[PDB]
């Protein structure tokens, strides 16, 4: 078996290998990449997402989110407080202000130490989940707005035609903006391109060990666990690498820099943070190997994890026994 220790693998496709997206995902899996839950893909030197980022300041962040923490430095939740709309230009200025800017630091490891020491004492503002794309329409390779849809994948694999659409999202980040521990909706894949700016550090648990993380989370967030059998779906819980190590949870870490893609694999729990002002684009996708994960994915039915209407058909077809209860939650 390839990659038995579940290490995060880094790939350097040639321009020829970058033509056929599905084929390259399958290639990475043939090398065991999925065992880690996360892979990095460095595009060929000839490729670009768009010509420049000089013209993006007028994008609107209609509902910036202030990420307010509670708990202890290494075990905390965050809630999102809505703020007034701002443009990307205004957001960049805010990110670079003395209150919010990245502190002096020696290297990525020093910055990581500062993040876990101090994150809870600040409330950064995140411009997350903005429907849109920054890929040029003429970019033909790895354009996240031109991938095969999950609806077409399900139809091709299972013969069922379903409603729903699948479009990318933009994320504008600043120092300390945080993504909580989660898997994707229906345990889908995700792909993530860091268009510009400062890095994003990722933590990931191998899919084969996801239940270990779930068990620890139930111990560490006992009230939340009583409220919902899939509370990690709420995307609010953080556990530091130190706490994971103390509890024997298998995980890996890596930092993504501008110009790099990250793929998360079905049932790969991940979390992380932004180093400073940046912009990422991401979308969920499926392959034939996803179907059996989608069939088995846990669901939140407590009300908290409201999601896109495109997930209706996925639950309805893949999880008919669970559908009525999940729908009540929506
Ligand atoms: C197009 C474009 C490309 C790169 C950037 C980088 N910006 N880097 C910071 O702003 C550093 C910082 N972030 N928070 N505190 N300091 C901006 C625009
Ligand atoms: N899947 N990709 C993520 O979870 C990454 C992410 N989410 N929010 N900010 N970054
Ligand atoms: Cl700090
Ligand atoms: Na490891
Ligand atoms: Ni994710
Ligand atoms: Zn729930």
Curated annotation (Swiss-Prot):
2-oxoglutarate binds at residues 126, 192, 200, 235. Residues 136-302 form the JmjC domain. GO terms for biological process: cellular response to ionizing radiation; chromatin remodeling; double-strand break repair via homologous recombination; inflammatory response; positive regulation of chromatin binding; positive regulation of double-strand break repair via nonhomologous end joining; regulation of gene expression; regulation of protein phosphorylation. It catalyses: N(6),N(6),N(6)-trimethyl-L-lysyl(9)-[histone H3] + 2 2-oxoglutarate + 2 O2 = N(6)-methyl-L-lysyl(9)-[histone H3] + 2 formaldehyde + 2 succinate + 2 CO2. Zn(2+) binds at residues 228, 234, 300, 302. It is an enzyme of class 1 (oxidoreductase). Binds 1 Fe(2+) ion per subunit. Keywords: ADP-ribosylation, Chromatin regulator, Dioxygenase, Iron, Metal-binding, Nucleus, Oxidoreductase, Transcription, Transcription regulation, Ubl conjugation, Zinc. Its EC number is 1.14.11.66. The keyword tRNA-binding does not apply. Its cofactor is Fe(2+). Fe cation binds at residues 182, 184, 270. GO terms for cellular component: blood microparticle; chromatin; nucleoplasm; nucleus; pericentric heterochromatin; site of double-strand break. GO terms for molecular function: chromatin DNA binding; damaged DNA binding; histone demethylase activity; histone H3K9 demethylase activity; histone H3K9me2/H3K9me3 demethylase activity; metal ion binding. Ubiquitinated via 'Lys-63'-linked ubiquitin chains. Deubiquitinated by USP14 with the help of TRIM14 leading to stabilization. Belongs to the JHDM3 histone demethylase family. Histone demethylase that specifically demethylates 'Lys-9' of histone H3, thereby playing a central role in histone code. Does not demethylate histone H3 'Lys-4', H3 'Lys-27', H3 'Lys-36' nor H4 'Lys-20'. Demethylates both di- and trimethylated H3 'Lys-9' residue, while it has no activity on monomethylated residues. Demethylation of Lys residue generates formaldehyde and succinate. This is Lysine-specific demethylase 4D. It comes from Homo sapiens. The gene is KDM4D.
